[PDB]
Design a protein around this ligand. Structure first.
Ligand SMILES: O=C(O)c1cccc(/C=N/n2c(S)nnc2-c2ccc(C(F)(F)F)cc2)c1
Ligand SMILES: [Ca+2]
Ligand SMILES: [Zn+2]
Ligand SMILES: [Zn+2]
Length: 231
């Protein structure tokens, strides 16, 4: 924490001239305070958001920080899988008038997970890249579905014009001890999905992820190696 800004419970860190990481925390029984990170991207006269915070109230804090500090309208948000860390604050996005997008499968799973679905569904080609007609006006956000991993619906995003790719919850940092897979993880394909993400954004040198500070491409290698052992 040096250069980090705080708004309420949220912490913000600039990653590049037009990119910030948002971080919110949830106190959990064993882990203590657990961070969830997402991204804010300034793209011309508009802002794009990747992932909510854990809660609606935390997510409203992101939006108020954007309003106060960047002062540009948030055009859209994309959420990266249907669990509370990434979709917990959908109601706040909706109340703010923001158009929301998620993988079709995330929207299908959302009711079962107790999450609110996004307003729009992204679909993907067989090579993993988003169908452009389902992601209109996404500017520099390049959305890629790497295959099943943490969940069957997890997606990732690269930011054109930067060194940054965001693996969301599929990628763990190079010091992580395990993947924390539950019954919805696909342990057969996890390693291939982590490598696919690596291959989709081969020029990214800063890997942003949900539960650790940004890492090098070591995070991708490490995640894939740990996943190799789940087979
Ligand atoms: O890697 C780590 O350090 C770390 C530590 C602790 C958790 C995680 C992952 N969190 N997570 C992912 S991913 N998908 N869903 C969740 C989630 C959903 C609800 C709850 C809660 F609290 F509400 F029940 C908690 C977690 C990752
Ligand atoms: Ca809610
Ligand atoms: Zn999850
Ligand atoms: Zn997560």
């Amino acid at each position: 924490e040096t250069g980090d800004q705080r708004f309420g419970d949220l912490v913000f860190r600039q990653l590049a001239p037009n990119v910030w990481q948002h971080t919110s925390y949830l106190d959990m029984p064993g882990f203590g305070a657990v961070a969830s990170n997402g991204l804010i991207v300034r793209d011309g006269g508009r802002v794009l958001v990747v992932d909510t915070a854990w809660t609606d109230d935390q997510t409203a804090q992101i939006l108020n920080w954007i309003k106060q500090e960047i002062n540009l309208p948030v055009a859209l948000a994309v959420v990266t899988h249907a669990h509370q860390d990434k979709m917990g604050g959908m109601d706040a996005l909706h109340a703010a008038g923001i158009a929301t997008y998620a993988n079709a499968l995330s929207n299908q799973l959302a009711p079962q997970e107790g999450m609110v679905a996004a307003q729009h569904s992204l679909t993907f080609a067989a090579n993993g890249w988003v169908e452009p007609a389902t992601a209109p006006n996404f500017g520099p956000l390049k959305v890629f579905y790497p295959g099943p991993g943490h969940t069957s619906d997890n997606i990732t995003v690269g930011i054109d014009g930067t060194d940054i790719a965001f693996g969301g919850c599929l990628i763990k940092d190079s010091k992580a001890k395990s993947l924390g897979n539950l019954g919805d993880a696909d342990t057969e394909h996890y390693a291939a999905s982590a490598r696919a993400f690596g291959a989709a954004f081969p020029k990214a040198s800063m890997i942003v992820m949900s539960h650790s500070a940004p890492d090098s491409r070591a995070a991708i290698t490490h995640t894939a190696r740990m996943a190799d052992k789940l087979r």
